[PDB]
């Protein structure tokens, strides 16, 4: 009746992610569930360095572009329906919710 449910969240924005991440944890704290989280995984910075000029004249100057991607994990023990009851609240834009079942 109790599984091992892992919910993984990804985002480009720290705060919009952490709002939802805290909301899930507290929504599963009212049900006296075992919430082992949130676990923080190394920020992935996607980087592309590009020449500013379109024509290759002048000083060679570069601009470094970066996307920060953040990876949170929440652990739960429940049935998938109780969690689906919990992970049904209003989700901020840009947040990925990808609940699965670990072994």
């Amino acid at each position: 009746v109790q599984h091992r449910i892992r919910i993984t969240l990804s985002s480009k924005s720290v705060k919009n992610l952490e709002k939802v991440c805290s909301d899930l944890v507290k929504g599963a704290k009212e049900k006296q569930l075992k919430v082992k989280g949130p676990v923080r995984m190394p920020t992935k910075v996607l980087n592309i360095t590009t020449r500013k000029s379109p024509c290759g004249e002048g000083t060679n100057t570069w601009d470094r572009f970066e996307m920060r991607v953040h990876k949170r994990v929440i652990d739960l023990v429940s049935s998938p329906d109780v969690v689906k009851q919990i992970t049904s609240i209003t989700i901020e834009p840009g947040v990925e919710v990808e609940v699965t079942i670990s072994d």
């Binding site: 590009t50 601009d63 470094r64």
Partner: protein
Amino acid sequence: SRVCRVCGNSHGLIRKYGLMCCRQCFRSNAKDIGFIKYR
């Protein structure tokens, strides 16, 4: 045999991460895609 998705040009192509844009179209659309100039 590999062109910019935005303009179909053959030079200065960015295939990293799956973008497949040329170095000028990527600059024009970098902010829209989500690439921020931090440092």
